[PDB]
Amino acid sequence: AMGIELFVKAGIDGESIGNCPFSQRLFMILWLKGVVFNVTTVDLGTHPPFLTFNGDVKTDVNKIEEFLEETLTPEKYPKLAAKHRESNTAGIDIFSKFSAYIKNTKQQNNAALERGLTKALKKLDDYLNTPLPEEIDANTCGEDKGSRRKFLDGDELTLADCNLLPKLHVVKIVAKKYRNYDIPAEMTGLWRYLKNAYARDEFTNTCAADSEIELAYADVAKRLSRS
């Protein structure tokens, strides 16, 4: 549990944080562990973020996640794994539906691709509004018999949030910029969750700027040119 050097994507100015949900994932985990670590922004290009632990390189973000959760343990470090399996699968198809949506150039497919994104957002909204069994037991449910928990697994950030929140933020920023798409406000559980994340330094201070996320997709997101 020493000598941790994180390497994340650099923004256009060479110093600030670039757009990379996987970089922010690892940045959030390390921060939420309370471990001492340094972070460096580098070009990276198409390469994934990575870290060194006591001078040994660790690669592959999912393997890095397991290594950190197994190496930084109680009592000195908190366990961050979600306790509910549904927390690990909630929202899993959102990024892929968003990507297919912003990449299509045919106006004929836009409505179906938008409904697919909206539906995948709605399943995530349902999970965040359905009370977890401990909330029902604790009678901590909202007056509407709905969940008021702050994040996927409970009121604490878990590894599943470190995965999903960077991607969901990118979806919000990019779908708005390049399709004028708004995550419906009636998705109150999804919006409660995003705003809970925006209120936490661990997300906000590891986040790439709005302009950075939008510019990073300027070649990826396509205009509805063809019919």
Author numbering: 25 to 251
What does the original paper state about this entry?
We demonstrate that purified CLIC5 directly interacts with the membrane and induces fusion, as reflected by increased liposomal diameter and lipid and content mixing between liposomes. Moreover, we show that this activity is facilitated by acidic pH, a known trigger for CLICs’ transition to a membrane-associated conformation, and that increased exposure of the hydrophobic inter-domain interface is crucial for this process.
Of note, to facilitate the crystallization of F34D, a small flexible loop (residues 57-68) was removed (CLIC5–Δloop). Similar to other CLIC proteins, CLIC5-Δloop-F34D consists of tightly packed TRX and α domains, connected by a flexible linker. Despite the marked functional effect conferred by the F34D mutation, the static high-resolution structure of the compact conformation reveals no significant differences between WT and F34D. In contrast to the crystalline environment, CLICs exhibit structural flexibility in solution, with an elongated conformation in which the inter-domain interface is exposed. First, to assess the structural effects of acidic pH on protein dynamics, leading to enhanced membrane fusion, we compared the HDX profile of CLIC5-WT at pH 7.5 and 5.546. This increase likely reflects increased exposure to the bulk. Thus, our pH-dependence HDX-MS analyses support a population shift mechanism, skewing the conformational distribution towards the elongated form. Importantly, the transition to the elongated conformation involves the exposure of the hydrophobic inter-domain interface to the bulk, providing a mechanistic paradigm for the triggering event necessary for membrane interaction, initiating membrane fusion.
